[PDB]
Structure formats: structure tokens, C-alpha cells
């Protein structure tokens, strides 16, 4: 039988052109007033997954 | 390009079908795959599940001075188990059309260099009789052969069933292993024309 994708991971990562994955930053859901604007601005755009935790992502979603 | 032995007619055959470099690996792979396809692969041992016997522990976990057992059927016991029991499986393996054609083009061109390929005009026995076919190969100086024919005659077919070292395949039904196995290959001018078009 075929491999099943870890769907939760499929809803948190997207495959870029090279091979790496874009993901949304943590710490931008609630408790925002105490955080500085500079943080919240820097956390807004998407970000690339680090080379340490890339193998864990590549395993859990083998399709795309 | 291929002279005959009772005519000397210039049958101009295509260059890149009957005149190529012998790719050994491709041919090897195709003949190995063809061989692997010949398997039926019918066999089965029975796992510790499938053996007849109870699930019961014969003796308990502790207490007695004896190695902890859990089943009569366990593969380390006698008369029960076979750890990795075989299941009936299909050993046939995929061969790419272009690889199969390429291997045929490779082997069928090597027969021209080795002089196994004896191209001929009309090849057919008079009546459905082995005695005549066996007698006519004496003049042709042949023994272990693959008589390929476009128009497959029943008269010729029936007359080569009992002959072991002779085989009579149709021009459509050439094989990788057959072309290599037999010591000569006798192709009819029509069969060369059909095989030329088939391999292309």
C-alpha cells in the first residue's frame, strides 16, 4: 500500500522551487499587545525551514 | 546487404536494425528479465500462524527450570514455524519497449557478424513429415536451429515438433532467449521483411 502523508504537516508547510519548505512563524496568534510591533512585523512574512529540522519535514510529507 | 545461398540476391535491409554495436548489458538485462518472466513462482511454507496447533503455553513462564516458551509453533521449535515463510509471488519484471526492441536489434545484428543468421528464400517441407525435414537439413548443414517463417506452415510446424534441436517460431513470435540459444537462425525473406518492420 501507498504512503500516507502526515496531513497536519501538509497544512503547515509548502514546497518551494529549490526543494526547501516555507512555513508561517510561531508567536502571532494571541498575546500581541505586550509584544513590540517590530517582532509582530518580522513574524508576519513566511520563512524557510532550517537544515536541522528539514529531514523531519521531508519524511512526514513525501509527496510535494 | 545479406547474400543468400541459392540466389545471391541483394536484400537491402535497414542499417540501424541489423548493423549496430552489441550492447551486452541491455541484452543481458532483457534475457534475464525474459528468464524471470518464465517463472510461475508457486510455493508456500506456513508461518507460526498457519501451522496446526494450539496457542497454549505448554509450560508456564517461571517456576520450572526450562527456557520460557510461548507456543509449540514457534520457528525455533521442531515441527512448526518457518520464520519467513514464502508466499506465492510473481517474479516477472518490467522491460521498457525501447529496451526490448533495442536488445533484439542488438542480438539480431550480432548474428550477422558471427554468421549464425542464415537468410533464405522460400523454406517449406513438401508434406507434414519429419523424415523429409531432417533429410533436407543435411544438405543445408544445420542441426540446432530456429527456423523463423512469416507464413507459418502447419506442414512445416507439425514436422518440427518431434525434432528437439529444431524450433519453428513465427516471424512475429521471435524472442530474446531463442535468438541467442540456438546455434543458427534460418530466416525467410518474408520473415526478415516482417521483423524489419516489427523492430523498425
Amino acid at each position: 500500500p501507498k504512503i500516507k502523508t502526515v496531513r497536519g504537516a501538509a497544512k503547515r508547510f509548502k514546497k518551494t522551487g529549490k526543494g526547501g519548505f516555507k512555513h508561517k512563524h510561531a508567536n502571532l496568534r494571541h498575546i500581541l499587545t505586550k509584544k513590540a510591533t517590530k517582532r509582530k512585523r518580522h513574524l508576519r512574512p513566511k520563512a524557510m525551514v532550517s537544515k536541522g529540522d528539514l529531514g523531519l519535514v521531508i519524511a512526514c510529507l513525501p509527496y510535494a | 546487404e545479406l547474400v543468400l545461398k541459392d540466389a545471391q540476391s541483394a536484400l537491402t535491409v535497414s542499417e540501424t536494425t541489423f548493423g549496430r554495436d552489441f550492447n551486452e548489458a541491455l541484452v543481458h538485462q532483457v534475457v534475464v528479465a525474459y528468464a524471470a518472466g518464465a517463472r510461475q513462482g508457486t510455493r508456500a511454507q506456513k508461518t507460526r500462524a498457519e501451522v496446526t496447533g494450539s496457542g497454549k503455553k505448554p509450560w508456564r513462564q517461571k517456576g520450572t527450570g526450562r527456557a520460557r516458551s510461548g507456543s509449540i509453533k514457534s520457528p525455533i521449535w521442531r515441527s512448526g514455524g518457518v520464520t519467513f515463510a514464502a508466499r506465492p509471488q510473481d517474479h516477472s519484471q518490467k522491460v521498457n519497449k525501447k529496451m526490448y526492441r533495442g536488445a533484439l536489434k542488438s542480438i539480431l545484428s550480432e548474428l550477422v557478424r558471427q554468421d549464425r543468421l542464415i537468410v533464405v528464400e522460400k523454406f517449406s517441407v513438401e508434406a507434414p513429415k519429419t523424415k523429409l525435414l531432417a533429410q533436407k537439413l543435411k544438405d543445408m548443414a544445420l542441426e540446432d536451429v530456429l527456423i523463423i517463417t512469416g507464413e507459418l506452415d502447419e506442414n512445416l510446424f507439425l514436422a518440427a515438433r518431434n525434432l528437439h534441436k529444431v524450433d519453428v517460431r513465427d516471424a512475429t513470435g521471435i524472442d530474446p532467449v531463442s535468438l541467442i540459444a540456438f546455434d543458427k537462425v534460418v530466416m525467410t525473406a518474408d520473415a526478415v521483411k516482417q521483423v524489419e518492420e516489427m523492430l523498425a
Binding site: 497536519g8 503547515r12 512563524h25 513566511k46 512526514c60 | -
Partner: protein
Amino acid sequence: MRLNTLSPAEGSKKAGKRLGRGIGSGLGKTGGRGHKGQKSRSGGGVRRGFEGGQMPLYRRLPKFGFTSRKAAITAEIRLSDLAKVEGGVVDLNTLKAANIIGIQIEFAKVILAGEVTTPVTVRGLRVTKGARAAIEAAGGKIE
């Protein structure tokens, strides 16, 4: 060539690692899997994305977006595979016969992938600004 004389290409075959066959094998006694622990055990090893009970990367990061319904039924036609249909007419049903785009694709777009020669009148199809220069430079008039 005989049925015996055939042999494979060097490097094609590689035998295979056979675990638990003496010292001389190299791997043998603990078949390349060390001493004890969960990973040494038969049917061992943790599941995917398991970081020792720490909250995994695929759960500590937030989930984003929504899968579009329209994106599933729209194609990106390569301009290289443009003049392979019916002379110089590429509506939709004509393009579908040439097996360039899938059956359930109503919307489709011609991007600048390079190389056109023949004039192609692109009807009933969305065209890119770079492809609009190319298609017209080749000859054909869009819409």
C-alpha cells in the same frame, strides 16, 4: 554470444547487506544497529515527526492558508508545446485532443517558455504579456 557468455555492466549489481553472518562479514551480531534501546528492537524505531515527546515542528508551527478550488482546474500551457494541435487554432477542445492539458481544465494560460515558429491564432484562452509579444512576433493574432 551464448546464453552463458552474457554478463552485466560493472557496478550494476551490488550483492546486498546480509546481517548476522559472523565477525568477518563486518555487520554481524547486532546487524548494524548497536547495543540495546528502542531502535535495536524488532519493530522498533519511533514514528515520523517524533522528537522524543517534545512538541513536534509540524505542531509547534501554525497552520496557514486554504486550498483553492479554482487552482485545481487551471493549467499553465507552455508556449513550446503550442504549435502541436491543429495548424494554428488552439481554443480548448482542440488543445485537449493533443494531450497538453487535463480533461477537467476550463481555464488555461500561455506563458513565455521560449520558441515559436508558425503563426497560431490563440482563441478563447488567456495569454501572458511576454507570450503576446512572442506569438505576434511569430505571426499569429490572439483572440
